[PDB]
Design a protein around this ligand. Sequence first.
Ligand SMILES: C[S@@+](CC[C@H](N)C(=O)[O-])C[C@H]1O[C@@H](n2cnc3c(N)ncnc32)[C@H](O)[C@@H]1O
Ligand SMILES: [Zn+2]
Lengths: 297, 113
Amino acid sequence: SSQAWQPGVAMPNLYKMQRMLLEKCDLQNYGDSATLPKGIMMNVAKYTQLCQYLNTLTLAVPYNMRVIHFGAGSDKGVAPGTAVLRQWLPTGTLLVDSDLNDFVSDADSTLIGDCATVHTANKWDLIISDMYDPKTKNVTKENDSKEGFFTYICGFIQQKLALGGSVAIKITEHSWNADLYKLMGHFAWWTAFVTNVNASSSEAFLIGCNYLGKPREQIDGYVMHANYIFWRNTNPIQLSSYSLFDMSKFPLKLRGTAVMSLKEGQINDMILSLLSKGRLIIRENNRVVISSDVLVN
Amino acid sequence: AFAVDAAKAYKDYLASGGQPITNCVKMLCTHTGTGQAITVTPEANMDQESFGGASCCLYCRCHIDHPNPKGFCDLKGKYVQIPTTCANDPVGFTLRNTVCTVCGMWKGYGCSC
Ligand SMILES: C[S@@+](CC[C@H](N)C(=O)[O-])C[C@H]1O[C@@H](n2cnc3c(N)ncnc32)[C@H](O)[C@@H]1O
Ligand SMILES: [Zn+2]
């Protein structure tokens, strides 16, 4: 029997513990395609499977949840992933959108420009990034840890993610960052999730579940990305869109997670344990204010 | 007195045989929903498709001001249900049709008042 009825496949724990050297990625199923339901675009399918997978973790879901979505624009000028996020998230969830280029979106607010121009006053409960630069897919250069928007994402997580909050960040064979992997060790749980509908690609979502302040595990990011490529190279994932046909349990369960503003070494071992089970968010609940920097001539 | 009439321009482009605005965002759902026209979450019944609202506003898609004093889009952030037989032109369908203000359904495609 199969993972073909799952939304996707998560990196098994034994692969996280290896010490592999980086290899070229060579997917057995490179040219396969799932058969999408009629008229459904790949990005809708892909975000739906990510959300179906997130439904199985211990996400903190407060009242007045705050979600920010980077890399939300598409080359068609609409935002299919944030339409899926808005469908998944409880009604009334505050959802902010951003992309390099102009696009039309269902978010409550949209910032256009380089993510490095984006500032927010407050902390967030859930950060989704689909940011990707296709020019990183070059097989004639050594595959090194990438900077660019990954430097911003790492800083944004460390400064603007509430304790207890969660993260899902798109990576690929060539689009990755060693510090992002090291940051996954500051969550109560982490994985690399491959959606079944796009399993012919080296794309995965790095998912960090329940942010703690501190390193829980020490993770070497260069080794961990090598472990990820090794996993993908030796475990063909069958392309599948089966999970897209059962949406009866899709919306994220509204759990009313408690929100508290603690400070400093008020973070008891009891507090950390509540964070780790998805039962606590630590941040303020002021107004949400955002802005982008505008450079003048 | 001058104002750009984007709705009329689109209606006439369609009558001339233009390819309707593409890439409206069709959602996955159970197709067991209330069937109402514009909703907070996808509500298509067995004879409807649900679309993300912003990707079906002419004004939104064309980067044109919305036609009312306080430029407000009643589609953005919502989901719009389109009969499957019209779902090749969701932008057109929402322009040319009206929501029953008591029923919630499209007049002519659901309101039974
Ligand atoms: C494949 S697309 C995302 C597709 C989109 N999420 C969807 O729902 O279909 C990758 C996006 O990342 C954005 N991006 C890449 N680098 C960026 C940067 N430094 N800052 C902001 N956005 C960036 C690109 O503009 C592009 O729209
Ligand atoms: Zn009626």
